[PDB]
Amino acid sequence: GADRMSKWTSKRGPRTFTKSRGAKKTGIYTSDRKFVQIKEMVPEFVVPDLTGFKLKPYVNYRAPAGIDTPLTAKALFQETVAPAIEKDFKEGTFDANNLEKYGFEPTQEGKLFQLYPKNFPR
Amino acid sequence: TVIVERWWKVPLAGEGRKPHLHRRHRVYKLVEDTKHRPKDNLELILTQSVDEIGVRGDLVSVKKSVGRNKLLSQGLAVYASPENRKLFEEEKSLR
Amino acid sequence: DALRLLQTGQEKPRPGAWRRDIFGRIVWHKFKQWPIPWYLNKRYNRRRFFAMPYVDRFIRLRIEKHARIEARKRSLQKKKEKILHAKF
Amino acid sequence: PLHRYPVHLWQKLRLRQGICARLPAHFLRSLEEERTPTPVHYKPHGTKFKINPKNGQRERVEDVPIPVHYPPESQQGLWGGEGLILGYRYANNDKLSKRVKKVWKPQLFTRELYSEILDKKFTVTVTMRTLDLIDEAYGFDFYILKTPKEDLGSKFGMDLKRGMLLRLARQDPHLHPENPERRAAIYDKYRSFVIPEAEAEWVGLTLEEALEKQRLLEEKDPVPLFKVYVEELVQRLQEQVL
Amino acid sequence: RARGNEYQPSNIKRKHKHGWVRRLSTPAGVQVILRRMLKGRKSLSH
Amino acid sequence: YRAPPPPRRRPGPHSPDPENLLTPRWQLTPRYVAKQFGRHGAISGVPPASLWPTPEQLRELEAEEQEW
RNA sequence: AACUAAUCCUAGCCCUAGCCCUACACAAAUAUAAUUAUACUAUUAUAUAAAUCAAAACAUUUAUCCUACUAAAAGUAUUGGAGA
Ligand SMILES: [Mg+2]
Ligand SMILES: [Mg+2]
């Protein structure tokens, strides 16, 4: 006579059955049955100063919208990296080994913000 | 090894094709069991002196059990292959 | 997205792989973060990424079932065109 | 509806597409060809024609092999082509009696065998038929190298073959080191079986083992798109300077 | 005695006898799931 | 209206594709190759010498004749 | 002199022909009592299909089931409680 179709949650079942509703953990449980919160595990909101800011939620109807051009890897490379290499190549002071000079990173290890595997949230 | 034979005939299949078998073609009768055949002997050429068999370079016919367990395993003898026969005979002639 | 491509060349931020589950299907598996390597993790080892031979029959049955649905759909489109051409 | 291809051709179709296609040609040939094993449990017909006694006329004859069951334990040893025979018998040897289930089992022994090319002794489950085949081949090493896969009938045996073939192909000095004269004698004796090392690598491998091997060969971390674009720019700029 | 009441509900018993982990424990149970997937059942297990 | 062109049998020798998996097997035998020469003569391109038995085949033919 | 009712046409489906496939569906969650962000505790199909049924019972036997090109040779040679 049990309901097979409704979702299985902790409001159901006996006392000893418990599970989470999706909130992230913020601490650890030791022996002696004591909870110990960790400060670094609690998310911190980075809020900017909004004094003197000119932008608002809405825009005027008379503002012309622009043709859509999604950014691509090619476009970013040309705007930022291409000019410096071109000047150095003309001078002849360019080599493959020193690509790091132009901003290339060999590996993501050591960086606080790693691009793969991502180690930070939105 | 056990060798068996069908009781029931299997109709011919053809040149490139395979016969289709039925559950009655799974009934067998035993034609022979090889383990009961009379035993044979093994031919070997001695490489070192050994009691009551020979000294060196002489072909000997021995029971399969002895040849496989004592002579070959211990290195005292070698297989009487055509190449082994040729090498040993030449050494005997020169001696 | 553009910056990640330049520095690493990867098209996804989260690691994953193509694997076969115990039901005979091919699914993308998203990885998780662990403090220890996989060969020492007993909870992870209980998870199976292979199918045994009794699943082969069901793989064929799925393929045939998908084939029937496609045939009926194309047949219906052809019949609908007949009505339109007659009307116009 | 109907399938585009008959069912029995599905296996060949799979080998013809995907990463299976990228496998080397001659190893695909080994999987494709199927050769019937030498008779063991039945007597083959000597002739192709026989005189039927009842009507006294010439009739065609064929050889139809018995089906044999190979337990998975057989793959850990060297059975001489033998297996289990699962069948029926007639009680009292008359067709009008009851039909009874029967199984004929091979007699198995444990023996120790020595390989010159590998210079190691193994312990193996074996049949008396296997021992006789060794004698007829004039050594344990000859048996492994001469016998084809179907007659050998063991995954262990095919692994031994790969080791011997690779050892001979490379002339590896690991055999009897510090005695170059002895090593030369062994390698020369088996000079007929030498094949190129590339082929020897994939001998005896199953399809799953082959696919894992191929995947490891071509696995590569992607290339940063930063380097790729730099090469294009330098290539274009250098030509422009010319 | 009066019959008709043989179901004495217990969630621990229900999940252990007919649950997801129980079905996957044996090859016969895995084939139970495959049949219900081919039929299209909305409920594969308890 | 005007009726379409009458159906016609395709003329000339026929060489099936060996690699294709769906080509019927009987069309790939030496017997089928021999038939092409018989119907179409030299235009087939079959090397005429092939029609006769090869030396290995000849020995089998002679051996059987003596037996029976 | 009317209540209860009745009239309707298209939603889709069926059998063939043709053709392999490359469909493997944002984020997050799930093999733990599935759909619960992290260690405890390891993981693995199957020896020969049987019986009903026909033989007017039943005990050897019983097409397909247990697939290998069409047309013919031919229901011929052969097999069978020589009988179905
Ligand atoms: Mg009830
Ligand atoms: Mg009856």
Curated annotation (Swiss-Prot), chain A:
It is found in: Mitochondrion. Its main location: mitochondrion. It comes from Mus musculus. Belongs to the mitochondrion-specific ribosomal protein mL41 family. Keywords: Apoptosis, Cell cycle, Mitochondrion, Ribonucleoprotein, Ribosomal protein, Transit peptide. This is Large ribosomal subunit protein mL41. GO terms for biological process: apoptotic process; mitochondrial translation; translation. It comes from the Eukaryota. The keyword Ribonucleoprotein applies. It holds the Pfam family MRP-L27. The lineage of its organism: Eukaryota, Metazoa, Chordata, Craniata, Vertebrata. Component of the mitochondrial ribosome large subunit (39S) which comprises a 16S rRNA and about 50 distinct proteins. Interacts with BCL2. GO terms for cellular component: mitochondrial inner membrane; mitochondrial large ribosomal subunit; mitochondrion; ribonucleoprotein complex. One of its GO terms (molecular function) is structural constituent of ribosome. InterPro entries: Ribosomal_mL41 (IPR019189). Component of the mitochondrial ribosome large subunit. Also involved in apoptosis and cell cycle. Enhances p53/TP53 stability, thereby contributing to p53/TP53-induced apoptosis in response to growth-inhibitory condition. Enhances p53/TP53 translocation to the mitochondria. Has the ability to arrest the cell cycle at the G1 phase, possibly by stabilizing the CDKN1A and CDKN1B (p27Kip1) proteins.
Curated annotation (Swiss-Prot), chain B:
Belongs to the bacterial ribosomal protein bL9 family. This is Large ribosomal subunit protein bL9m. It is found in: Mitochondrion. The chain holds residues 50 to 144 of 265 of the full protein. It comes from the Eukaryota. Component of the mitochondrial ribosome large subunit (39S) which comprises a 16S rRNA and about 50 distinct proteins.
UniProtKB/Swiss-Prot annotation, chain C:
GO terms for biological process: mitochondrial translation. GO terms for molecular function: structural constituent of ribosome. Signal peptide: none annotated. GO terms for cellular component: mitochondrial inner membrane; mitochondrial large ribosomal subunit; mitochondrion. Residues 78-88 have a biased composition (Basic residues). It is found in: Mitochondrion. Keywords: Acetylation, Mitochondrion, Ribonucleoprotein, Ribosomal protein, Transit peptide. Belongs to the universal ribosomal protein uL29 family. Component of the mitochondrial ribosome large subunit (39S) which comprises a 16S rRNA and about 50 distinct proteins. This is Large ribosomal subunit protein uL29m. The gene is Mrpl47.
From Swiss-Prot, chain F:
Residues 1-23 are annotated as: Disordered. The gene is Gadd45gip1. Component of the mitochondrial ribosome large subunit (39S) which comprises a 16S rRNA and about 50 distinct proteins. Interacts with GADD45A, GADD45B and GADD45G. Interacts with NR4A1 via the NR4A1 AB domain. Interacts with ATAD3A and ATAD3B. Acts as a negative regulator of G1 to S cell cycle phase progression by inhibiting cyclin-dependent kinases. Inhibitory effects are additive with GADD45 proteins but also occur in the absence of GADD45 proteins. Acts as a repressor of the orphan nuclear receptor NR4A1 by inhibiting AB domain-mediated transcriptional activity. May be involved in the hormone-mediated regulation of NR4A1 transcriptional activity. May play a role in mitochondrial protein synthesis. This is Large ribosomal subunit protein mL64. Belongs to the mitochondrion-specific ribosomal protein mL64 family. It is found in: Mitochondrion; Nucleus.
